[PDB]
Amino acid sequence: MLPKLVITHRVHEEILQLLAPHCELITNQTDSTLTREEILRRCRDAQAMMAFMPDRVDADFLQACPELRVIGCALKGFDNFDVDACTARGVWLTFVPDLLTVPTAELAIGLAVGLGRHLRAADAFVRSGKFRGWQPRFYGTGLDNATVGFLGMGAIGLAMADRLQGWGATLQYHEAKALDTQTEQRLGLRQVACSELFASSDFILLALPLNADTLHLVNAELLALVRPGALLVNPCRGSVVDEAAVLAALERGQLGGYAADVFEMEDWARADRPQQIDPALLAHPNTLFTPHIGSAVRAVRLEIERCAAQNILQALAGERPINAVNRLP
Amino acid sequence: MLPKLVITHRVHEEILQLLAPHCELITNQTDSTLTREEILRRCRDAQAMMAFMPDRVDADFLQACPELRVIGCALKGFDNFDVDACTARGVWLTFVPDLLTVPTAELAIGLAVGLGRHLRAADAFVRSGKFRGWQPRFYGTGLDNATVGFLGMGAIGLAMADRLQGWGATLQYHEAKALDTQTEQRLGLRQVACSELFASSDFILLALPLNADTLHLVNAELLALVRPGALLVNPCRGSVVDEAAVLAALERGQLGGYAADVFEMEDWARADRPQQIDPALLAHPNTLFTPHIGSAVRAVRLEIERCAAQNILQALAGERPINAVNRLPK
Numbered sequence: 001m002l003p004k005l006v007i008t009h010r011v012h013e014e015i016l017q018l019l020a021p022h023c024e025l026i027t028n029q030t031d032s033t034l035t036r037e038e039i040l041r042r043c044r045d046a047q048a049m050m051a052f053m054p055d056r057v058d059a060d061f062l063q064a065c066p067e068l069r070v071i072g073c074a075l076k077g078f079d080n081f082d083v084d085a086c087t088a089r090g091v092w093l094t095f096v097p098d099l100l101t102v103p104t105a106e107l108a109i110g111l112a113v114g115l116g117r118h119l120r121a122a123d124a125f126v127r128s129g130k131f132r133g134w135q136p137r138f139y140g141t142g143l144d145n146a147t148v149g150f151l152g153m154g155a156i157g158l159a160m161a162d163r164l165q166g167w168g169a170t171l172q173y174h175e176a177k178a179l180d181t182q183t184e185q186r187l188g189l190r191q192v193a194c195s196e197l198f199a200s201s202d203f204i205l206l207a208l209p210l211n212a213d214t215l216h217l218v219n220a221e222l223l224a225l226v227r228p229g230a231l232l233v234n235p236c237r238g239s240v241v242d243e244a245a246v247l248a249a250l251e252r253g254q255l256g257g258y259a260a261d262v263f264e265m266e267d268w269a270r271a272d273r274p275q276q277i278d279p280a281l282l283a284h285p286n287t288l289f290t291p292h293i294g295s296a297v298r299a300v301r302l303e304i305e306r307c308a309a310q311n312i313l314q315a316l317a318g319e320r321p322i323n324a325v326n327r328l329p
Numbered sequence: 330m331l332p333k334l335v336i337t338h339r340v341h342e343e344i345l346q347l348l349a350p351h352c353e354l355i356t357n358q359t360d361s362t363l364t365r366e367e368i369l370r371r372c373r374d375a376q377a378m379m380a381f382m383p384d385r386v387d388a389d390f391l392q393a394c395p396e397l398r399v400i401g402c403a404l405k406g407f408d409n410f411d412v413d414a415c416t417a418r419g420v421w422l423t424f425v426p427d428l429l430t431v432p433t434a435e436l437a438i439g440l441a442v443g444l445g446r447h448l449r450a451a452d453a454f455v456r457s458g459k460f461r462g463w464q465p466r467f468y469g470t471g472l473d474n475a476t477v478g479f480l481g482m483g484a485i486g487l488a489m490a491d492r493l494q495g496w497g498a499t500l501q502y503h504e505a506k507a508l509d510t511q512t513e514q515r516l517g518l519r520q521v522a523c524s525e526l527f528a529s530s531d532f533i534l535l536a537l538p539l540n541a542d543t544l545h546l547v548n549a550e551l552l553a554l555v556r557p558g559a560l561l562v563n564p565c566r567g568s569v570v571d572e573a574a575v576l577a578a579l580e581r582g583q584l585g586g587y588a589a590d591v592f593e594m595e596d597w598a599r600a601d602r603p604q605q606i607d608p609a610l611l612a613h614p615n616t617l618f619t620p621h622i623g624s625a626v627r628a629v630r631l632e633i634e635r636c637a638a639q640n641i642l643q644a645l646a647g648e649r650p651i652n653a654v655n656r657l658p659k
């Protein structure tokens with residue numbers, strides 16, 4: 001009897017090969033997410049869990065799964081995992097600190113370009129068969145000579161700033177914890193207050209985690225500050241914005257556009273989360289969406305899976321996992 | 330009576346005010362493209378013309394318009410304008426050398442990201458109302474650790490290289506006019522042969538003008554060399570590629586994707602040009618398209634128009650235009 005490991009979502013077969021000598025595997029090698037009932041059934045006597053974005057762990061989950069030694073999260077933002085409750089039950093909780101950063105940064109910039117240049121509608125027009133040559137339309141907004149404001153300047157903020165260096169924009173940021181002035185200057189970043197960031201930015205790129213303090217940070221009052229036509233890009237967590245306020249800002253035309261890779265409906269730890277994305281937001285023309293594909297780059301996903309696998313194996317071996325969030329004796 | 334200037338497409342009000350005290354303006358302040366005959370009719374007794382991407386000027390056109398002194402083009406690629414015939418008939422042909430570069434480079438990188446990451450299908454999926462959370466789907470290709478190959482390293486090529494500096498890609502290029510080593514080193518560029526460029530690149534970014542030598546340069550023989558899954562992005566001219574060969578490459582699955590801002594049907598100077606984009610190419614999933622919006626940024630278009638206006642005004646005043654493509658004896 002090897003320790004039992006439940007992997008809640010599909011992974012590369014070579015990751016299964018890496019784990020199999022050490023672990024009895026209970027896998028989900030499909031593109032589907034299992035019911036919460038079935039995850040509980042599988043994890044009841046599991047020694048370990050590899051968890052993904054659709055997963056949620058609270059005290060109630062853990063009491064129902066008394067054999068767990070480690071939850072290895074193949075993700076960065078562990079807002080749906082109660083770390084304190086894990087520590088209390090003697091369960092390691094591990095994450096992936098760096099591997100999701102670059103592909104998410106790349107996508108966020110592509111969304112900003114895609115949103116500013118009306119890519120969805122432009123591509124729709126070409127596919128329709130009615131392109132008859134160059135026309136005066138689909139006039140958009142570029143990054144050259146624009147002010148780009150970042151809310152947050154951790155891993156993804158810095159990766160995005162790195163990638164905008166050749167782009168002719170004026171970069172500013174708001175943080176809970178400032179960069180050192182030397183790094184600011186190497187990247188051409190100026191630190192500003194949050195109100196000013198929203199009042200003065202042509203592109204607003206969110207790069208902050210979801211917590212009690214950032215929940216609905218981007219609300220109606222903050223959005224009412226933006227320059228008419230400002231573009232808002234959300235690659236972080238859905239619930240840092242109030243999507244109802246975002247939609248209202250779009251409909252009034254104060255917000256020029258909203259691009260998102262993440263949605264309030266995904267933030268499982270939120271009882272008052274909406275059950276879906278508002279259909280009126282989904283149908284609004286001044287939008288561009290992706291289904292949480294920030295890290296959806298083939299080579300990176302394998303590396304992310306390997307990182308979670310390694311952390312789990314470290315825990316099961318009686319070591320402190322390299323990427324543990326918590327501390328155990 | 331002031332000289333007649335035919336402006337073929339809609340122009341910002343700031344530009345008309347600049348032109349009014351110098352020319353009798355025959356304008357087209359609609360967002361519609363007029364017919365070839367309508368242009369001929371208006372230009373028959375015109376001293377000047379402001380021309381745009383849909384316009385084509387050939388030997389017969391200039392013969393029908395003996396009064397022309399200048400054709401100011403609000404564009405970079407003048408492949409639809411017979412420069413030689415302009416020179417022969419003593420007509421200035423002007424362009425806009427730099428203003429289109431940046432917004433086109435921005436869009437091109439945007440297309441590369443969008444194509445690599447399956448943006449069209451991803452967005453359609455969310456819009457369907459069926460998104461229920463993350464799934465291990467839409468896995469694609471990023472620029473980090475990728476090899477990016479530039480065919481051409483002029484204005485747009487250089488601007489794209491500039492904009493990829495922090496992206497962790499290996500940048501290589503082929504050119505007709507090679508960069509000096511110190512510029513190559515400054516941008517982290519490595520010069521390669523065209524065949525090696527196509528054989529070794531994950532992303533192929535086209536940055537060439539269309540001329541006799543570049544017509545169907547990206548053909549079936551060249552596309553046969555690409556790595557499986559290679560992504561091709563075309564922000565320059567449709568006819569630099571053979572769209573039929575591109576489609577065939579997509580269908581066999583050797584080419585991973587094709588993104589384009591420009592299409593063969595736009596290249597009026599070609600008699601054998603296809604009259605539309607192949608419906609089969611339009612319908613292929615591994616594609617991303619824009620309708621020649623490379624420079625479609627409000628601030629930028631105002632400046633492009635002012636540039637073309639300034640060139641026309643300079644010519645009509647008896648000066649040589651700052652952005653003349655051709656040379657005329659004085």
Ligand SMILES: NC(=O)c1ccc[n+]([C@@H]2O[C@H](COP(=O)([O-])OP(=O)(O)OC[C@H]3O[C@@H](n4cnc5c(N)ncnc54)[C@H](O)[C@@H]3O)[C@@H](O)[C@H]2O)c1
Pocket residue numbers: 076077078097100101104151152153154155156157174175176177207208209210213214217235236237261262292293294295
């Ligand atoms: N879309 C995706 O696939 C994807 C991928 C990775 C991460 N994410 C999400 O993006 C978030 C940020 O990612 P990261 O890797 O940059 O995290 P990080 O922890 O490296 O950086 C987060 C930064 O936000 C700052 N911050 C906290 N509260 C703030 C506030 N009120 N105002 C301004 N800044 C504040 C923190 O000081 C920190 O520097 C993650 O927590 C995760 O939720 C999404």
Ligand SMILES: NC(=O)c1ccc[n+]([C@@H]2O[C@H](COP(=O)([O-])OP(=O)(O)OC[C@H]3O[C@@H](n4cnc5c(N)ncnc54)[C@H](O)[C@@H]3O)[C@@H](O)[C@H]2O)c1
Pocket residue numbers: 405406407426429430433480481482483484485486503504505506536537538539542543564565566590591621622623624
């Ligand atoms: N999509 C748009 O809206 C848009 C905007 C601007 C320009 N364009 C098009 O893109 C083209 C390139 O633009 P640019 O501003 O970089 O022009 P450019 O003249 O500055 O650069 C073209 C470069 O390509 C090189 N070249 C020529 N033949 C080559 C070959 N066979 N192999 C490799 N390199 C070769 C030339 O030496 C030159 O350096 C323009 O001619 C125009 O047709 C499109």
